[PDB]
Ligand binder design. Structure first.
Ligand SMILES: C[C@H](NS(=O)(=O)c1ccc(-c2sc(C(=O)NCC(C)(C)O)nc2C(=O)N2CCC(F)CC2)c(Cl)c1Cl)C(F)(F)F
Length: 228
């Protein structure tokens, strides 16, 4: 409850994210001028749907690994038992990756950084999931409008994992104390930087929750599955 303890928690989380961000934000915004050509896009469209589900799955798997390298660098998440740890990632791991996607999204041209270059949503037409593709560009566009900073995404994605409202938690009371200590540090950082406005413009939890459930439902059929 100490001010020093709260600030030390903000600093800790912001660094655990700076070390497991997969890509440097200084480079994601520097690559936006590198858009796919009309020929390179046609290559991604003629590809078989199995070829695309296999590529994207390697991307999501790799991304979910960083979200784990990030979760481990939290002095408080490791204090949870083997079971509670698995619960929070199994439910939250993918949701955090979906939040981190707003970084690689270009709100101007409505493109996303996919494999070295930025490309529109018609680049993934081979999947046949015309509707699912939109829910990502939509969810990412709303977050890219807020101008999410690295520390805000780090603090936000941290509150998506540590959530005492996850089913099957053994040390549920211990998760609440951790969730509060993060919710408190999240408010404190928005005051230091005068960012109280974004609190009422974030995606209502459950939307991010239901959105993720819709993608796994489609994802499982082609590639499996849980995953670790
Ligand atoms: C059924 C699908 N959903 S999905 O299977 O569950 C799925 C699969 C992969 C990713 C991730 S994570 C991630 C990352 O952080 N770093 C890696 C980079 C890209 C920087 O090289 N990249 C990606 C990615 O390649 N794509 C492909 C284009 C999409 F438009 C956005 C996501 C995610 Cl977010 C999801 Cl949702 C879908 F997309 F069809 F709906």
């Amino acid at each position: 409850a100490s001010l020093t303890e709260i600030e030390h928690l903000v600093q800790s989380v912001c660094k655990s994210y700076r070390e497991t961000c997969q890509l440097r934000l200084e480079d994601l915004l520097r690559q936006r001028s590198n858009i796919f050509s009309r020929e390179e896009v046609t290559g991604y469209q003629r590809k078989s749907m199995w070829e695309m589900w296999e590529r994207c799955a390697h991307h999501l798997t790799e991304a979910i690994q960083y979200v784990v390298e990030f979760a481990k660098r939290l002095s408080g998440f490791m204090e949870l038992c083997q079971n509670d740890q698995i619960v929070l990632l199994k439910a939250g791991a993918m949701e955090v990756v979906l939040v981190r996607m707003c970084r690689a999204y270009n709100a101007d041209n409505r493109t996303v950084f996919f494999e070295g270059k930025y490309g529109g949503m018609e680049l993934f037409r081979a999947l046949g999931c015309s509707e699912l593709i939109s829910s990502i560009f939509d969810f990412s566009h709303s977050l890219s409008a807020l101008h999410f900073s690295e520390d805000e995404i780090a603090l936000y994605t941290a509150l998506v994992l540590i959530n005492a409202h996850r089913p099957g938690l053994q040390e549920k009371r211990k998760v609440e104390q951790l969730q509060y200590n993060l919710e408190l540090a999240f408010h404190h950082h928005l005051c230091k930087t005068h960012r109280q406005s974004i609190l009422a413009k974030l995606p209502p939890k459950g939307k991010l929750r239901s959105l993720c459930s819709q993608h796994v439902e489609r994802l499982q059929i082609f590639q499996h599955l849980h995953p670790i």
